[PDB]
Amino acid sequence: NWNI
Amino acid sequence: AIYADNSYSIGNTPLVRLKHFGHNGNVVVKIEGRNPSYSVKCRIGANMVWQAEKDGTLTKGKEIVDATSGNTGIALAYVAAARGYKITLTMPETMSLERKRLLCGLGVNLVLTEGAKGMKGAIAKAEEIVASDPSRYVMLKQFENPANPQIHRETTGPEIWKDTDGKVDVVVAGVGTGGSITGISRAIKLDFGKQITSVAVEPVESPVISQTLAGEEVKPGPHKIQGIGAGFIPKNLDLSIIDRVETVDSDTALATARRLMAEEGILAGISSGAAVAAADRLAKLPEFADKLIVVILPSASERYLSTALF
């Protein structure tokens, strides 16, 4: 979910 | 003009009116899929590099290091290639072959981390690499780097202003880093002086902005809306310019993105479905009947072929  | 390299070609994305959403054409979408590496992050990839150059943190022969393999990783990869920088990206080994190949095609030094450690392992590996020779490596930190919202204040916001002849009344944007809604909102409210409604969108599964502003327990959760719902309030989210927060569920985000393709001929990504689902809900309130609603569509469909979207 932090892999943006 | 002729762009000196692909980083300078960012932005100038079109506005398209929706026919099957909203009421009497009050919903308009901005297609951020039309960018040098096909997402909104192209803008921030370019500007974080440019700002790092200008302030001297990034110099010839310095190497970029990060732990993103999502849109920002791709954006940084094209910018690094275009401007002659080496780049290392850390990512968990369980990431898709499609993503490994794309990143390798763009000339990234991919460092695969332990599948068991997920993103945390990749972030630690990146931080470790930088620590080993701080003068060799630079980490640009998209969640806190002000050059992120700044590019949206300088380009994305003014494009909305100009293409609507100042008629924009509402901006709807999913929040990942917060840079888009922050920069766009500061542009329109502060530089152009118009009191619009700024609408942040987050997953109903991880509604941390909603919980924060209500003074409730912050409880992040898993969801499928790639690119939003980080599960914390990022530094680049300026809550002072947020007027409203809409939550959207993953299934409805997906279904909406599918409708954009089949009914509008717009090849939108998952988070684009989320932003439109939120905009459609506001657009069908009598209070927004006569209001022009502009929605950010962060990315494009083909990047999601191996996902629940298809």
Question: Which sign does the torsion angle of CA B157, B153, B199, B167 carry?
Answer: negative
Name the token pair of B15: 């506005």
Q: Which of B68, B220, B223 sits opposite A3 (nearest CB)?
A: B68
Asked if B180 and B150 count as a contact pair (C-beta separation under 8 A), the reply is no
Amino acid at B240: S
User: Per the annotation, does B215 bind a ligand?
Assistant: no
Instruction: Give the DSSP letter of residue A1.
Output: -
Q: Which residues of B are catalytic?
A: 41, 271
Asked if B1-40+145-310 and B42-144 have one fold, the answer is yes
How many other C-beta atoms lie within 10 A of the C-beta of residue B118?
15
Asked if B275 and B295 count as a contact pair (C-beta separation under 8 A), the reply is yes
Q: Is B133 exposed, middle or buried (0-12, 13-18, 19+ CB in 10 A)?
A: exposed
User: Per the annotation, does B26 bind a ligand?
Assistant: no
Paired with B90 in beta bridges are: B111
d(CA B5, CA A1): 31
Burial B167-205 (b: 16+ CB within 10 A, else e): ebbbbbbbbbbbbbbbbbbbbbbeebeeebbbbbbbbbb
Place of tokens 């409805």: B252
d(CA B115, CA B123): 13
Angle between helices B270-283 and B250-259 (to 10 degrees): 90
Edge to edge, what strands does the sheet with B27-31 contain? B15-17, B27-31, B292-297, B168-174, B197-203, B244-248
Going by C-beta distance under 8 Å and a sequence separation of 6 or more, which residues neighbour residue B190? none
Name the token pair of B95: 């990431």
Q: Which of B70, B123, B206 sits opposite A4 (nearest CB)?
A: B70
Going by C-beta distance under 8 Å and a sequence separation of 6 or more, which residues neighbour residue B215? none
Asked if B308 and B224 count as a contact pair (C-beta separation under 8 A), the reply is yes
Reference B28, options B276, B250, B230; nearest CA is: B276
Question: Hey, where are the domains in chain B?
Answer: 1-40+145-310, 42-144
Residue of A nearest to B66 (CA): A3
Reference B178, options B309, B256, B301, A4; nearest CA is: A4
d(CA B253, CA B67): 26
User: Per the annotation, does B83 bind a ligand?
Assistant: no
Reference B270, options B252, B287, B245, B290; nearest CA is: B252
Q: What is the DSSP string of chain B?
A: ---SSGGGG---PPEEE-SSSSSTT-EEEEETTSSTTSBTHHHHHHHHHHHHHHTTSS-TT-EEEE---SHHHHHHHHHHHHHT--EEEEEETTS-HHHHHHHHHTT-EEEEE-GGGHHHHHHHHHHHHHHH-TTTEE---TTT-THHHHHIIIIIHHHHHHHTTT-EEEEEEE-SSSHHHHHHHHIIIIIS---PEEEEEEETTS-HHHHHHTT----------TTS--SS--TT--GGG--EEEEE-HHHHHHHHHHIIIII---B-HHHHHHHHHHHHHHTSGGGTT-EEEEEE-BBGGGGTTSTT-
Set of chain A residues whose Cβ sits within 8 Å of the Cβ of B231: 1-2
- Tell me whether residues B223 and A2 touch, CB distance under 8 A: no
Asked if B257 and B269 count as a contact pair (C-beta separation under 8 A), the reply is yes
- Tell me whether residues B119 and A1 touch, CB distance under 8 A: yes
User: Per the annotation, does B176 bind a ligand?
Assistant: yes
Paired with B47 in beta bridges are: none
Q: Which CATH number fits domain B1-40+145-310: 1.10.3080.10, 3.40.50.1100, 3.40.50.620, 3.30.300.30?
A: 3.40.50.1100
- Tell me whether residues A1 and B229 touch, CB distance under 8 A: yes
Class of domain B42-144: alpha beta
Query: Which method was it determined by?
Result: X-ray
Q: Which of B41, B222, B230 sits opposite A2 (nearest CB)?
A: B230
The β-bridge relationship of strands B27-31 and B15-17 is antiparallel
Paired with B295 in beta bridges are: B29, B172
- Tell me whether residues B70 and A1 touch, CB distance under 8 A: no
Name the token pair of B37: 């590496």
Amino acid at B219: K
- Tell me whether residues B227 and A1 touch, CB distance under 8 A: no
